[PDB]
Amino acid sequence: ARTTPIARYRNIGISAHIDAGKTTTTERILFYTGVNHKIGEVHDGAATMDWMEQEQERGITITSAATTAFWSGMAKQYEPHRINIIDTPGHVDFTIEVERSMRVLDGAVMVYCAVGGVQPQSETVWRQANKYKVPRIAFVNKMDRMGANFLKVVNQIKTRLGANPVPLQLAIGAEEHFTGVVDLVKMKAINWNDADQGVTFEYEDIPADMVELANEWHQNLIESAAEASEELMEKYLGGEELTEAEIKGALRQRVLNNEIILVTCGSAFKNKGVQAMLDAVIDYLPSPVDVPAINGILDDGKDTPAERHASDDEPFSALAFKIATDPFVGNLTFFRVYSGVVNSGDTVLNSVKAARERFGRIVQMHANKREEIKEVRAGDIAAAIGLKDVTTGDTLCDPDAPIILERMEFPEPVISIAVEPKTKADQEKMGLALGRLAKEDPSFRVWTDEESNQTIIAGMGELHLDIIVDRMKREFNVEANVGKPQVAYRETIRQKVTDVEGKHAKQSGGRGQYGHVVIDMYPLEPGSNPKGYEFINDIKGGVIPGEYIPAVDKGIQEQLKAGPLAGYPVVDMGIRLHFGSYHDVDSSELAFKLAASIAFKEGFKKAKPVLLEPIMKVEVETPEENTGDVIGDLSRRRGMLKGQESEVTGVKIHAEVPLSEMFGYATQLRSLTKGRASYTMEFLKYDEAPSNVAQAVIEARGK
Amino acid sequence: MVTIRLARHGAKKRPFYQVVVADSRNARNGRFIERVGFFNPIASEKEEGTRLDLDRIAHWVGQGATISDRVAALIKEVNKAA
Amino acid sequence: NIKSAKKRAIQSEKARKHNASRRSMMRTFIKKVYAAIEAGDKAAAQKAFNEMQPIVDRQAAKGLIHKNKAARHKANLTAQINKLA
Amino acid sequence: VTSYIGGEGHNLQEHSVILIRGGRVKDLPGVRYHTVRGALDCSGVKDRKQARSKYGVKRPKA
Amino acid sequence: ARYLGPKLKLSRREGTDLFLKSGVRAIDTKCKIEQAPGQHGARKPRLSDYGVQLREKQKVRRIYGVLERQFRNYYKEAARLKGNTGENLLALLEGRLDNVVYRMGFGATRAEARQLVSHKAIMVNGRVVNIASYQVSPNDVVSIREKAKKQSRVKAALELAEQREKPTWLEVDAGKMEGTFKRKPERSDLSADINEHLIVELYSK
RNA sequence: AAAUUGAAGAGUUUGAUCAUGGCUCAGAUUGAACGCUGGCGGCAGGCCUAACACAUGCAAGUCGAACGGUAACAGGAAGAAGCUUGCUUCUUUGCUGACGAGUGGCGGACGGGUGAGUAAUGUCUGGGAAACUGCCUGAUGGAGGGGGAUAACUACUGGAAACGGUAGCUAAUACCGCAUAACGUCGCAAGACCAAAGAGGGGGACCUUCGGGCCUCUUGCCAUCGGAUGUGCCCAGAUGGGAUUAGCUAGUAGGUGGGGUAACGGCUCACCUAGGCGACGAUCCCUAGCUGGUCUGAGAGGAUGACCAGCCACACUGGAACUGAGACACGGUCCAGACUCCUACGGGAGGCAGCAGUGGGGAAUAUUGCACAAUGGGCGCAAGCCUGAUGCAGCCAUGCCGCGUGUAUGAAGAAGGCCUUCGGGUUGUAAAGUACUUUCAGCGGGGAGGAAGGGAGUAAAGUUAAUACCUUUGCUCAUUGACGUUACCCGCAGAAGAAGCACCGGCUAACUCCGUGCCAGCAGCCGCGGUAAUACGGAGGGUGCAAGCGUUAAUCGGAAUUACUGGGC
Ligand SMILES: Nc1nc2c(ncn2[C@@H]2O[C@H](COP(=O)(O)OP(=O)(O)O)[C@@H](O)[C@H]2O)c(=O)[nH]1
């Protein structure tokens, strides 16, 4: 049956700040397990994790692509394990890729730089890991570089993110004296070989230049591991050290229970430390079943409605966590089999999307190459082909219903612009690619606009939309030249009512019959009637026909929606009507409506409404380093501001800003605070401002 | 090798084969040098729900043809010993 | 190739070498006889004919040429030989 | 070639796609093609209640 | 597919009595059956040649409940048959299982008779036929399939079944609820109110 | 006995008529498209354009009863791990089942897709001689005897990946020569020459090198003449338009000779003749697969090649041949050109017009589905394997047919709409009400047929020399269905869960009001609308058709409007 027992699976995630070396370490791992020759780099694009040709050229990993191998811990290089790495990107623009990946792994090796320690994006993915208690260890990449330290990085992780890091390694040599790693469990120092030949280890003796500090952090690791359970404390208290195996199991339980984070060092570029990091992957990260059993739920929520676990006998129950765009077969859906066994062509009931699906093929991955395989079992990541109804986050299972998996969460985009192809004939050929992209990615929302005929889209940064626009030009060969979204001005009178009439009749020569009504233009204050239109009747002279009074309000409705100022729907407006003329015959409401048209268009313009501009309620949460700076930028924009409250990890600041100005505000916001600010933009009120941009529509049509 | 097989004329979920003498090259419904008798496997009361043409079948199998399994069984039947 | 036609291509090439060899022997002897004919030496011609006749008959029976081809050959050569007088 | 635009009130700019069906106009000179109302953003005539299939109007619910 | 809607509208537009409603009480006491259903029936339309042709064909169609489709086929066959095409058309129209059911009773009108024939509550010579267009052959018992009795609507219909001519082709037992089909009903065995030659010329136009 | 019993007209030039005369209309039909709407079921249909480029999964294998043998699985033998000499498994051992890879034999040239090419190298009709023909069949014989490799392999070396070498062997139905063969080939004869393979099943006699031999039987091989199937070739006739296309052709036409093809042939070569085609249309040009038939027509006729079937040509484009019975070969070869993919940079792989599916074009046409259970087909002795042929399924009202969306009752003619002569008319028995039923779809239960066959056990003769092996015929036993929750039957509650579209001026079947005023608009022709619109739009009401309705496109008819039947100057 299955090629390996479950305990040989290690579903690990690689995620960190940008450029911290995720892809380099992943390629080194692939080489050191032997599915890749020619270790390769990224700045020359030849790496195999990078295929989309954007990360070939631009040398930035943009999307996660799972990959598997056979590296081993028991008599390493033998007794193979199954390490499923997922090379996730670390960009704040692509944090959605981290989100869904971090929600689908059972562990993940976090990467830290020895130059800067943690970085704002790492503090972000730390929240995205605590969000799911994903067990995790640290890999201090880039020790080989100038000014790189190890203990400082350890202190950084200890102090800033709030965790407890324990050294599983100590480094021999800082910048270019880095020649290998000394350990605190094996207590022997490894000196890797020369360039691209770091496959070997050459176990060697610990040099005396570091023996004392090695001993210090060794005993510290010893006591911190014994902290796991009582029977490890007293044995140590008796004047006896624990041994490798029980220290390893105890720390491993700490990682299972998400109490600790282990740090390993290395330099994925000088080909040092990669194997010793794989050592930690094996020795401490939970296997699929070592993790607590998945919380499955029936169509109703309980404590244990569907107790599922990784088994060949358990029902097929998995989480479709990633879609991908494939031109050939339409889509390509990743899925991580939490429990059970499923085969090619077999059935599956989309428990969430309320349908049955089928697996045209099931392909496991080599970062792009879709390996054709018969079946996939528990703990084994795979990509399903052909299933139509499913999207991200959905749950795929047998008819026995572990229907509810816990998550349906994804962030809200912050940047928005509009797009337009070579000509307005290809608009459906553009919206089609947009639909594919919006079904592939949750945060990226294609936003058909109703006020104008433009197609605006929303992403989480200048870079994310930039890959999307090129990926659109590249994969879907329709180039779209971009611009800003149009503004959403509006109309309403200040306070004053003005008496006005409009007169014209029809039948002087025997024609059809007429209409005539007197109106007075009263507004309400912005936000008075929640229904944008409020009416009070006062007809007493020339009483319009009994089936025509409501149609008078419904005809001034047209004039409201018309908005004789610049075409804009007049809001909170009110009209009061007094006079008219009628007979007990069949008059025409349309003439009363045109009559009311002339009346509206004159009396409004002379009652002097206001031409408002969209003003948004803003909330921004940013650390206390650049509160003054971000507030300064906001005030330079149009700063209307709400208040100030100190959160645990920052400050609570809300404000009021024009939608005519907030367009590219996201990149500037993050650039003003190193990207440690959180914020959402939503509407509060419409309002006026002295601006000579107020005549664009008036120029296109109207007064 | 002039096989004598069944041709599967008729309709969906309603077979009505046709005894044909044809080259074993051509298709099932394909070219044949002659057809000899019909066969229907859901005929409740029709012409025996089966018929062969023993004179012409003898002509062919004597001059050097062969016989498929269904046509052979149908002749085993029409020869009323069983 | 993608199918078990590779074995067939290999067997066909082997048979190509071999049938080329046998055909070449046949035509070598036929050119022998045709030289003997264009020369004028009748006894030599009939000798060459008897030298080639068993070869070509064996070959036709091997199927490299067809019985009609072997018979046509022997007929051509016998006729022109008895004309050589 | 040319094309009529039936019904009351259209929304066809300089680059909007439309469908063309046969049938001349018998009074407009040289126009021999009715624009199929209600297909490919050449949306149907608004506020119709009789003969909606031709002229492309969604059946009102009521 | 069945004509849904008002019935006396049809009978009154066609003016003549077509028996759409149960022949229980009367027709002109319930509907003012002389004028069109429209508010403009007080006017006398002129009804030129094609008017009378369409009216005749629509009369026979509303009597028998068959629609223009399958009616064009009831012309196709019964023209394919040798002999008078109009008379063969009336023959196949009479042989329809619903028509024979109603004419032997079991249902006071063609609509009740079709509801019966379609509700799997009849048995042409032993076999449950749920096909309101089953063309019945001569020498066929109709065998109303007991447990299709004891509902009192078929009984009331069998009661009302008399005061009507016992048709010279039916020979309904009338009490064991069966009926032979001696021979195909003649054209002369019918009302002679309906000009079948009108329908023939209408369709051969 | 039946093989047909089958031919319609109108609007429209004029003040008005008649006639020629064209435009349009009612009809039938469609691989259809789109708008509106849309319940089910059965059966059929589904890339007409871009023969445009194609990701991926499959679309051709089989045979141990041909061979060497042992890659994997086991039946296995002897053991001293395991171990209670094993029921608690170590290996040598193809010894047997079975079989990776290899040799070999058969298939792959079938089945399937497309219509680019093709105006005649074709197709169809009817004949002909100058031939071939595996597997299939009738008949007649032979089935000595031996050797040389070579694969697999082994060793070594490349492939720093894929993908190949240098030597050493060893088998076969692989291959080669001698023996022999004639009504076979050549030859007038005289005369000469020609081939082959063995395997499997059983066992009484008797010799053995337990290998067997041997007498059997089942298969197989070679040769030769027939049968049949398929196939090659030839001829006469028909098989689109354009003469704004009048000449065209040197292997061109033929004679002779040589060669070649399986076969006859300027198929080819070499002479020699100067001929040959042509107004019955040569040549050139455009276009096109042909046909059985399909749509139409009363018939002649017109248009056409969707489905199913026969023929042909083609398989990225151009060219060539190799094996073969059969190819100049879709999933074979080789070369040139384009393209694509892999490359470790030294190279290498591929051909969806196969089924699915993508992208592009389009207005437009389906799942990356289920199984060999039937039929088949290849191989096999058979079980048995392959089968995107096939049988089924999924999508879509694409079409044809059937069915229901309730049935009866009901004058307070309810309300209310609309009209109005102001009394009422009509919606209208229509709904409401009342009773009856449950088709269909939804649940629940029950349940045909498509299933022939083949396995084991058995008997009768048949076989021999053996009643053994094996055909072959019965017999009993377990069984082989994808569809599939089949069709279908019966029960369950309720009338619920199911009607729309177009038209209403004449042609045409169906009329009034309000709203518009040559504006908005309608329209197939005639035309309507410039204040009383049955012609626009809405309302009411009606007429048609009804899971369709309408529009468009398209062929034909009506068109006696290319008139041969059937017209005119
Ligand atoms: N010095 C040093 N440079 C590194 C290391 N890892 C990655 N880099 C450099 O970082 C650049 C991009 O690395 P990349 O794989 O894109 O990091 P990622 O973006 O987190 O995957 C390259 O130029 C590498 O040379 C390291 O361990 N040491």
Side-chain angles (χ1 to χ4, degrees):
Chain A
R2 214 204 315 179
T3 197
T4 172
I6 196 74
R8 289 186 170 275
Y9 277 91
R10 298 271 197 280
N11 282 321
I12 75 165
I14 280 296
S15 292
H17 182 87
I18 294 92
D19 196 83
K22 294 174 275 286
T23 305
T24 53
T25 315
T26 283
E27 295 290 349
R28 263 53 163 159
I29 279 175
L30 290 205
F31 183 95
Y32 283 12
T33 72
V35 76
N36 265 35
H37 37 88
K38 319 171 308 170
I39 57 173
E41 312 310 327
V42 57
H43 40 284
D44 49 5
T48 178
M49 186 68 41
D50 310 345
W51 74 101
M52 304 164 86
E53 179 267 342
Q54 293 110 28
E55 59 258 18
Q56 258 185 51
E57 265 67 0
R58 308 183 43 168
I60 51 152
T61 306
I62 67 176
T63 184
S64 89
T67 312
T68 63
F70 292 143
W71 175 250
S72 86
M74 32 193 62
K76 63 207 285 288
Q77 199 254 330
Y78 281 152
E79 290 288 328
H81 273 54
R82 169 85 171 252
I83 288 94
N84 314 304
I85 43 165
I86 288 187
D87 167 70
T88 80
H91 294 248
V92 62
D93 295 23
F94 294 102
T95 291
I96 177 64
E97 306 273 353
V98 150
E99 172 56 34
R100 66 188 174 186
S101 276
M102 274 296 166
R103 191 256 173 270
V104 80
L105 272 298
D106 304 276
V109 181
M110 221 58 62
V111 170
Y112 289 81
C113 294
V115 57
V118 312
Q119 293 173 276
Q121 269 311 285
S122 285
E123 194 152 351
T124 307
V125 301
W126 194 267
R127 297 185 77 204
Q128 302 277 250
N130 308 334
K131 173 155 174 41
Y132 305 122
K133 275 178 283 184
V134 187
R136 65 186 87 89
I137 79 167
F139 174 46
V140 175
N141 188 38
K142 306 218 189 182
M143 276 279 299
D144 65 296
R145 262 174 50 258
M146 331 294 267
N149 323 322
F150 179 85
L151 268 43
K152 185 198 73 177
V153 165
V154 167
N155 184 297
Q156 271 274 342
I157 283 178
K158 153 175 306 182
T159 44
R160 209 186 280 242
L161 299 172
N164 182 14
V166 191
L168 267 59
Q169 307 207 330
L170 289 180
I172 320 287
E175 302 183 328
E176 195 64 353
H177 192 266
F178 188 62
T179 195
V181 173
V182 70
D183 201 319
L184 301 181
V185 302
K186 180 72 177 177
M187 208 64 173
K188 297 295 169 71
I190 308 91
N191 311 336
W192 274 269
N193 217 307
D194 52 357
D196 76 46
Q197 281 105 32
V199 183
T200 197
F201 47 100
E202 288 292 45
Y203 262 125
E204 267 156 42
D205 311 0
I206 176 164
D209 61 15
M210 292 196 66
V211 61
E212 199 283 313
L213 273 299
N215 275 28
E216 172 44 48
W217 291 127
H218 184 109
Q219 191 203 325
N220 271 333
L221 170 85
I222 290 297
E223 80 167 358
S224 44
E227 285 169 342
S229 68
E230 293 88 352
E231 41 187 344
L232 277 303
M233 287 193 209
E234 170 167 357
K235 183 187 175 300
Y236 185 59
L237 262 170
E240 196 102 1
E241 185 182 355
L242 323 165
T243 300
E244 292 182 38
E246 68 268 21
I247 305 151
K248 288 174 184 185
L251 279 189
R252 190 164 205 277
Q253 197 270 358
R254 297 208 82 169
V255 184
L256 320 172
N257 203 6
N258 194 29
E259 187 39 61
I260 205 71
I261 175 153
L262 316 180
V263 307
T264 83
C265 85
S267 89
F269 196 61
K270 313 305 177 180
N271 299 317
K272 313 189 178 189
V274 172
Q275 289 184 359
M277 190 267 309
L278 269 188
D279 185 273
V281 189
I282 294 140
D283 272 26
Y284 297 88
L285 273 194
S287 77
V289 179
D290 217 328
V291 173
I294 160 203
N295 27 44
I297 304 146
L298 287 165
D299 66 349
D300 197 5
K302 304 81 170 192
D303 187 20
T304 183
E307 190 271 311
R308 305 302 177 99
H309 76 278
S311 175
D312 305 340
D313 194 337
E314 197 71 21
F316 165 49
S317 159
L319 175 77
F321 78 99
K322 158 159 155 56
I323 321 292
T325 288
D326 178 359
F328 307 125
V329 67
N331 70 353
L332 190 150
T333 293
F334 284 64
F335 66 102
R336 188 254 179 272
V337 176
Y338 269 98
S339 49
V341 182
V342 71
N343 291 42
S344 314
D346 266 358
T347 177
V348 59
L349 164 56
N350 189 338
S351 282
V352 169
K353 281 283 194 69
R356 181 185 304 271
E357 316 311 301
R358 195 152 64 179
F359 286 6
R361 291 158 45 184
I362 306 166
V363 291
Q364 66 154 357
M365 289 295 176
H366 172 272
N368 189 38
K369 182 186 230 202
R370 290 149 278 204
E371 275 101 354
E372 188 48 44
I373 76 186
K374 178 47 178 94
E375 89 291 5
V376 299
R377 294 186 175 91
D380 188 328
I381 288 176
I385 310 305
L387 80 175
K388 307 157 272 167
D389 303 317
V390 180
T391 179
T392 172
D394 310 348
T395 297
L396 276 53
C397 59
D398 299 340
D400 57 22
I403 293 180
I404 300 295
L405 280 210
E406 39 195 20
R407 178 201 143 252
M408 213 55 225
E409 163 59 30
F410 49 84
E412 194 64 28
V414 293
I415 285 291
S416 313
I417 56 157
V419 302
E420 202 276 326
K422 66 180 80 173
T423 191
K424 275 188 47 205
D426 309 65
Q427 295 305 342
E428 191 202 294
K429 287 183 63 213
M430 196 255 291
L432 208 65
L434 256 174
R436 310 192 68 158
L437 265 295
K439 289 201 166 189
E440 179 186 56
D441 207 317
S443 70
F444 168 85
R445 332 284 170 78
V446 56
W447 195 245
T448 320
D449 181 85
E450 314 273 319
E451 181 177 30
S452 157
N453 56 5
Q454 57 184 14
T455 302
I456 79 155
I457 54 191
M460 293 198 63
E462 54 93 21
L463 209 154
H464 179 268
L465 285 199
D466 187 26
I467 255 63
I468 295 303
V469 69
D470 65 52
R471 259 267 273 96
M472 187 184 131
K473 171 170 162 157
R474 280 278 287 97
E475 278 212 16
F476 304 81
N477 76 330
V478 58
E479 75 297 334
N481 300 315
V482 288
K484 282 196 297 180
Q486 315 298 102
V487 291
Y489 305 149
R490 273 148 69 111
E491 317 174 8
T492 294
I493 325 166
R494 30 192 193 183
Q495 193 254 310
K496 193 46 155 45
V497 76
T498 75
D499 304 330
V500 59
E501 75 93 26
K503 180 158 190 165
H504 183 267
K506 194 187 169 215
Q507 67 266 0
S508 171
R511 316 173 219 185
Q513 299 188 356
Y514 63 74
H516 165 80
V517 176
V518 156
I519 57 146
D520 304 337
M521 304 288 215
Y522 75 94
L524 317 180
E525 60 283 4
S528 178
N529 43 353
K531 332 296 193 201
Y533 200 39
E534 193 35 72
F535 203 93
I536 296 154
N537 62 84
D538 300 67
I539 279 298
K540 187 222 291 163
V543 193
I544 44 166
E547 311 269 18
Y548 285 61
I549 307 93
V552 172
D553 181 27
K554 266 199 70 153
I556 302 195
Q557 184 53 278
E558 183 282 316
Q559 305 151 11
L560 188 85
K561 196 84 170 84
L565 171 141
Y568 295 111
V570 183
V571 299
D572 272 19
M573 165 60 173
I575 188 53
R576 182 257 192 172
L577 82 172
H578 194 192
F579 263 47
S581 88
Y582 88 100
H583 213 177
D584 301 327
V585 289
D586 291 333
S587 65
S588 297
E589 175 57 40
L590 321 157
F592 289 95
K593 142 126 216 63
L594 178 71
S597 79
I598 302 166
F600 202 91
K601 70 97 174 179
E602 296 151 322
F604 212 74
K605 175 184 68 174
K606 307 327 287 164
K608 191 58 182 173
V610 176
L611 172 49
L612 292 76
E613 63 156 49
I615 308 311
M616 323 308 280
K617 177 211 163 201
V618 176
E619 175 268 330
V620 300
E621 201 278 346
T622 185
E624 50 261 18
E625 281 88 5
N626 309 339
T627 74
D629 262 345
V630 58
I631 288 287
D633 169 82
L634 264 185
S635 180
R636 311 265 268 290
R637 296 229 156 170
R638 280 301 183 298
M640 328 174 182
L641 323 174
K642 284 266 275 199
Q644 148 57 41
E645 289 183 354
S646 157
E647 188 182 359
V648 172
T649 42
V651 307
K652 187 66 77 176
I653 289 180
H654 329 271
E656 314 83 70
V657 196
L659 192 49
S660 157
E661 293 206 324
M662 291 272 288
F663 291 124
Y665 167 58
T667 74
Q668 273 76 342
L669 206 180
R670 279 202 270 281
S671 158
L672 264 297
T673 182
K674 315 183 182 164
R676 257 179 301 214
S678 41
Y679 65 98
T680 66
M681 159 261 298
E682 280 296 332
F683 162 79
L684 183 139
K685 70 156 179 144
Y686 287 94
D687 202 312
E688 53 208 273
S691 59
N692 273 335
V693 59
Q695 73 277 350
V697 267
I698 311 188
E699 151 193 335
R701 48 167 169 175
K703 296 224 60 183
Chain B
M1 186 188 81
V2 188
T3 291
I4 308 187
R5 63 202 181 281
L6 299 197
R8 182 60 142 98
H9 290 63
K12 187 173 102 161
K13 284 304 193 41
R14 193 151 266 271
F16 176 103
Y17 312 102
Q18 286 219 31
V19 197
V20 302
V21 310
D23 191 324
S24 184
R25 285 154 151 170
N26 292 320
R28 166 178 87 193
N29 273 318
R31 187 178 188 171
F32 53 79
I33 50 173
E34 191 41 44
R35 59 153 283 170
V36 283
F38 75 99
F39 162 59
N40 175 2
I42 44 175
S44 297
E45 303 296 330
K46 272 209 65 188
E47 271 200 25
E48 204 190 343
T50 293
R51 174 165 78 214
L52 278 303
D53 184 291
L54 304 195
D55 302 317
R56 288 321 286 180
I57 285 177
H59 192 268
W60 278 126
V61 309
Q63 268 189 19
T66 184
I67 301 190
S68 163
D69 60 286
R70 281 309 287 268
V71 173
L74 260 56
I75 288 172
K76 280 307 168 196
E77 179 267 357
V78 170
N79 284 179
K80 300 307 295 168
Chain C
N1 285 101
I2 306 93
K3 287 219 179 324
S4 68
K6 290 185 279 194
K7 188 160 171 176
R8 278 310 282 240
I10 282 167
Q11 300 186 29
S12 276
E13 188 64 22
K14 198 170 142 213
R16 180 182 77 90
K17 285 159 207 301
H18 196 65
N19 295 32
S21 311
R22 294 318 150 203
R23 200 177 279 92
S24 287
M25 177 175 70
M26 305 170 35
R27 287 195 290 241
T28 308
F29 280 108
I30 301 172
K31 301 303 177 191
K32 279 261 197 52
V33 180
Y34 270 125
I37 299 147
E38 51 83 18
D41 45 358
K42 216 168 182 56
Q46 177 48 60
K47 166 208 294 300
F49 189 112
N50 184 211
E51 190 169 280
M52 59 96 59
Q53 184 176 1
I55 291 290
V56 298
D57 271 22
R58 212 167 295 96
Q59 295 312 324
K62 295 309 193 331
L64 177 148
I65 67 167
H66 205 276
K67 286 186 33 160
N68 290 113
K69 175 150 170 81
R72 163 175 82 264
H73 264 310
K74 302 186 298 196
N76 279 52
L77 301 184
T78 290
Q80 190 50 257
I81 286 171
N82 294 26
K83 291 266 212 300
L84 188 138
Chain D
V1 298
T2 77
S3 157
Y4 198 100
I5 308 109
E8 40 194 2
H10 62 76
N11 57 7
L12 279 51
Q13 295 87 19
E14 42 173 59
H15 292 138
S16 278
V17 293
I18 69 173
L19 256 63
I20 294 320
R21 65 164 149 115
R24 62 180 184 174
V25 183
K26 190 192 197 291
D27 60 338
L28 301 175
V31 174
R32 323 182 307 291
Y33 293 101
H34 278 70
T35 285
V36 189
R37 310 288 331 240
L40 260 57
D41 85 4
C42 194
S43 316
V45 295
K46 306 174 209 336
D47 217 35
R48 194 62 82 99
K49 316 286 194 153
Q50 288 188 336
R52 307 179 327 286
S53 91
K54 315 189 313 305
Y55 305 161
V57 184
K58 292 290 184 182
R59 166 180 178 274
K61 279 71 62 180
Chain E
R2 278 175 60 256
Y3 186 109
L4 263 280
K7 282 86 186 169
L8 287 175
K9 161 194 277 195
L10 296 184
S11 45
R12 190 177 72 191
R13 161 58 86 163
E14 196 57 30
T16 82
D17 264 4
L18 302 102
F19 302 120
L20 295 93
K21 281 279 201 163
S22 175
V24 56
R25 169 177 75 152
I27 205 69
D28 56 348
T29 185
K30 211 191 309 184
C31 72
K32 177 196 287 169
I33 179 170
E34 295 146 16
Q35 64 182 58
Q39 82 204 357
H40 322 267
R43 303 138 186 74
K44 181 261 175 190
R46 295 330 184 262
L47 288 174
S48 168
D49 56 83
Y50 180 93
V52 314
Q53 304 205 4
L54 182 89
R55 286 298 103 189
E56 179 50 284
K57 182 254 280 184
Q58 283 292 90
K59 159 163 48 190
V60 313
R61 273 194 60 258
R62 278 151 180 172
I63 273 176
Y64 287 140
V66 288
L67 279 82
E68 148 64 20
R69 191 57 75 180
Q70 166 210 352
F71 197 103
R72 208 197 54 106
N73 304 149
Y74 277 167
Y75 176 90
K76 276 292 284 191
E77 58 205 351
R80 180 192 60 98
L81 311 193
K82 281 195 177 78
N84 176 292
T85 308
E87 293 161 11
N88 292 317
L89 155 63
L90 263 184
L92 317 179
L93 273 186
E94 292 295 317
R96 295 178 23 91
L97 185 51
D98 177 75
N99 205 14
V100 79
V101 158
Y102 164 80
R103 288 271 186 69
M104 300 202 326
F106 311 110
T109 183
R110 262 66 170 270
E112 187 178 349
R114 261 177 81 105
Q115 196 66 54
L116 257 295
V117 185
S118 285
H119 274 180
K120 280 188 194 191
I122 319 287
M123 281 199 309
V124 175
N125 54 28
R127 300 188 168 190
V128 173
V129 165
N130 57 11
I131 289 310
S133 42
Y134 192 107
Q135 205 145 294
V136 184
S137 88
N139 311 332
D140 213 319
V141 56
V142 171
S143 160
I144 314 297
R145 184 192 176 278
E146 66 273 12
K147 192 262 182 182
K149 307 174 186 177
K150 48 210 164 272
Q151 54 201 359
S152 74
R153 84 178 173 204
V154 57
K155 290 322 288 180
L158 189 57
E159 165 172 359
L160 299 169
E162 277 67 6
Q163 307 107 40
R164 228 188 298 108
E165 310 216 317
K166 187 93 165 212
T168 78
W169 74 82
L170 275 188
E171 217 173 15
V172 55
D173 170 87
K176 290 301 295 181
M177 271 156 172
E178 307 92 346
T180 315
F181 207 80
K182 301 197 301 178
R183 47 144 153 68
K184 52 160 292 281
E186 310 286 304
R187 155 65 153 87
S188 316
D189 295 348
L190 277 161
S191 172
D193 177 76
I194 53 177
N195 281 255
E196 74 282 6
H197 83 92
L198 281 191
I199 290 140
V200 179
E201 90 177 276
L202 182 136
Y203 277 142
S204 89
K205 167 89 181 303

